[PDB]
Design a protein around this ligand. Structure first.
Ligand code: TIE
Ligand code: TIE
Ligand code: NCA
Ligand code: NCA
Ligand code: CL
Ligand code: CL
Ligand code: CL
Ligand code: NA
Lengths: 469, 469
């Protein structure tokens, strides 16, 4: 990895564009104000600091490689070789940057400063926004963690209403997204962001990322169970679906097992194969190791409701203390097709209307959880708010006439708790007046060193729901 | 990277689920039949084969690491240590897999086999679908390349209609997506997929990936120009926007320069600052080095039309041979906000209705180009179609009752030309009848080696538009 080749091309040319006599560029990240996504989980900067920004990130070889690439890419010599060589020679290739950030896992309303970046050497005024591109990719773990948390709020509301408690909430949304994301690196980052809120994942890449960059007291941060796929059912031949089911449940008789049941006819599988032919292998199972029937096609809500109606007629259903129907404890359902925050809401509301407890179900989400998200969802943005030119600080901002939502903050910023316990971003260096308590931004990176780190356990505690609290 | 930890968790348990005495699992990838996206660019498998699948990918240390993680992740011992040890011992950790694929850059209608995977050793029946997760991530470069090519078809239609030629087509959609994708790895993959169709990118990560995995005769596959961002304009102070513009155009007097003009008032900037105050610095520029004015906010079509109306009144507009208005050659526009395939269509049709040539404009697209895409767009899917159990080949498939779109192909597959020169996928080994000539798939991977490969130049030739041919 070469940090000189890890920026948007145009940023190579910006050192020639800033006002002459500029010694400081100070920039900030927010999820701009515009499911409403009123608050965001701050997560993932520590990964970026450690993997890409810390230590000796400039060498003679990286400077020459960048110079050679940019000569061809621009068909001109515009690269700031002198400025990068300055960092190599003066700081042994360590970036003269200070980053201050809200603690990871903090849940912050939209339109607040989450982190700030500034150069610590006047010669490196251009470096603050060089690293915008790398740092703005924090949008992704923020957005995954935030959208996963918003789904946890929906599950918590319906579980509480239909059962009176939150037991097993942290296992109710399982990551099925490894195949559906755009890269191996995205898989690890996204899976780790989902694990801020939940414990169930098949995206194995998330485990190694958490171990390397964050750390847990427990051996692993996420868990799974044996489960079939269409290949392990259909390989038996269509006439032998029952033989596949029997073999699989028997192989994993003492742990929970998920069995995809829609290869040919989900309704037949539930009513006749599970319901009658193999019923003796289901009713013998323990509470700790239930059979989890997995539909994977059709309208998500209609299919869940029809599967529950079938199973409720073939198995001994109880009524819990809230008046909701509960399958026996050896039998559960997972809906792992077509699940995103919108369809999750539709399914749990549909179940509540048909008097089915959310205790009966869990959800698998792949593309909806890890891929169907953009930087525009929370309006994640990085902008310069302060410069020093000719030794004088000036408050800098954009305010496009056709879009007031794109207006940016002015001056030096700080994040504070309000008297009512909410959050406020003070602009124009007004934090210096000390009318609002301590600034919540902490130095996390300075002059090539990570200065403050968070464990994954601390991040999970910070990101808890109020209902859990 | 550890390929043993690079699969969906449930696949760790599948070796125990296939029928006893299964010697072969044969699987295939397609963009299932369901802007219509009727044809897909096959691109990106070669990256995956080289980076993740070739050579010694199993070691004693990688087996022990996977064993230790899966013991905690499943809270049980289910990991196939013996199976992975067999590959390490017998094949020096090279995967006993054969992959056959359509040549990269090929443009193939939906619902055709694009690649097949099978084990070459009967002991490794379980390995075919272990690597589904890694291989299915090819959805991403396929989908970026396909959606980029569909935008090229729109630009080609309107450029031809308004100008009579395709001059500059390959520069008309520029990648601005580096900050808006989910990881560094995704940035390189997605940028490379856009460069199958276009030559303009700010996502520098794409260049290294292409050089390393594909190659080009030219020194670089993609190009950019100096350009401003809001920080380099706003840092001057709101009252000094003219000074910023003047400094920037003067710094890049002899190459094209893009200047974001919407920091405070895009209409004022065009009419008064560019139009009057700095007009003398614009009219003096060469055809090879125009000023490119960049709006970045407001309704994308309405803002482009108003910017063009303003500039047409301040600069000497001509009428081209098709009767469309053309700014002088020293002045162009780039719309780099809110561009996706839908808004691109809306803008070029709106320009045509107002008699503005598409010669006047280029587009920048970021999240729309590289991030706002999912595996569901082209229904990218990997399924088992053939197994050998007890020495007998079985044609296997899924056919869910509630969704006929999810039905999968049966048996051994091959790709052929029809008598009319179209594509057909033959099922159930019917390719062997030689009624449709030779299979168009080539072996690209066998027993740990990449056996056939494509330069980036060949991929570009394969992905050309008919209108270009
Ligand atoms: C489906 S509904 C269920 C399932 C299994 C069970 C068996 N019990 C377990 O697995 C342990 C112990 C008790 C708490 N607990 C869970 N509680 C509620 N719900 C859960 N769900 N899960 C889940 C597991 C695997 C996946 C892939 C997805 C979700 C796990 C859930 C995790 C009980 C209920
Ligand atoms: C805006 S419209 C233009 C712009 C610049 C120019 C100056 N000319 C160039 O740059 C070379 C030589 C001639 C062909 N040629 C281009 N032709 C049409 N169109 C283009 N567009 N571009 C483009 C450049 C940079 C970006 C970031 C995006 C698009 C580049 C374009 C690339 C002419 C027309
Ligand atoms: N465990 C599962 O059922 C699963 C995992 C990943 C994708 N789809 C299903
Ligand atoms: N070159 C540009 O104008 C640019 C690049 C990346 C993102 N936004 C704008
Ligand atoms: Cl060095
Ligand atoms: Cl599956
Ligand atoms: Cl910009
Ligand atoms: Na070894």
């Amino acid at each position: 990895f070469n940090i000189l080749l890890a920026t948007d091309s145009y940023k190579v040319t910006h050192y020639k564009q800033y006002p002459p006599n500029t010694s400081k560029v100070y920039s900030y990240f927010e999820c701009r104000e515009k499911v409403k996504y009123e608050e965001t989980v701050f997560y993932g900067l520590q990964y970026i600091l450690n993997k890409y920004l810390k230590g000796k990130v400039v060498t003679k070889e990286k400077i020459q490689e960048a110079k050679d690439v940019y000569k061809e890419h621009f068909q001109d010599d515009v690269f700031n070789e002198k400025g990068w060589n300055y960092i190599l020679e003066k700081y042994d290739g360590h970036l003269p940057i200070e980053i201050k950030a809200v603690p990871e896992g903090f849940v912050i309303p939209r339109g607040n400063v989450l982190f700030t970046v500034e150069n610590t050497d006047p010669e490196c005024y251009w470096l603050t926004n060089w690293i915008e591109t790398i740092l703005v990719q924090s949008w992704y773990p923020i957005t995954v963690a935030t959208n996963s948390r918003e789904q946890k709020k929906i599950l918590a509301k319906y579980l509480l209403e239909t059962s009176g408690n939150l037991d097993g909430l942290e296992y109710k949304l399982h990551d099925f997204g490894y195949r559906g994301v755009s890269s191996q690196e995205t898989a690890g980052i996204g899976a780790s962001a989902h694990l801020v809120n939940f414990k169930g994942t098949d995206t194995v890449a998330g485990l190694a990322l958490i171990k390397k960059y964050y750390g847990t007291k427990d051996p692993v941060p996420g868990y799974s169970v044996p489960a079939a796929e269409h290949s392990t059912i259909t390989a038996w031949g269509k006439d032998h679906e029952k033989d596949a089911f029997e073999h699989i449940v028997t192989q994993f008789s003492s742990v929970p097992v998920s069995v995809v049941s829609d290869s040919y006819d989900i309704y037949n599988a539930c009513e006749k194969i599970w319901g009658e032919d193999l019923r003796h292998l289901i009713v013998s199972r323990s509470t700790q190791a239930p059979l989890i029937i997995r539909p994977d096609s059709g309208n998500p809500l209609d299919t869940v409701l029809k599967v529950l109606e079938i199973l409720g007629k073939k198995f001994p259903v109880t009524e819990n203390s809230k008046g909701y129907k509960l399958l026996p404890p050896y039998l559960r359902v997972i809906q792992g097709d077509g699940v995103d925050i919108n369809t999750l809401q539709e399914i749990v509301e549909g179940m509540k209307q048909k008097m089915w407890s959310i205790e009966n179900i869990a959800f698998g989400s792949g593309g909806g959880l890890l891929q169907k998200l953009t930087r525009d969802l929370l309006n994640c943005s990085f902008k310069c708010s302060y410069v020093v030119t000719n030794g004088l600080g000036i408050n800098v901002f954009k305010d496009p006439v056709a879009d007031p939502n794109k207006r940016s903050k002015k001056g030096r910023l700080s994040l504070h708790r309000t008297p009512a316990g909410n959050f406020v971003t003070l602009e124009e260096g007004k934090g210096d007046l000390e009318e609002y308590g301590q600034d919540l931004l902490h130095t996390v990176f300075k002059n090539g060193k990570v200065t403050k780190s968070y464990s994954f356990d601390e991040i999970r505690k910070n990101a808890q729901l109020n209902i859990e609290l």
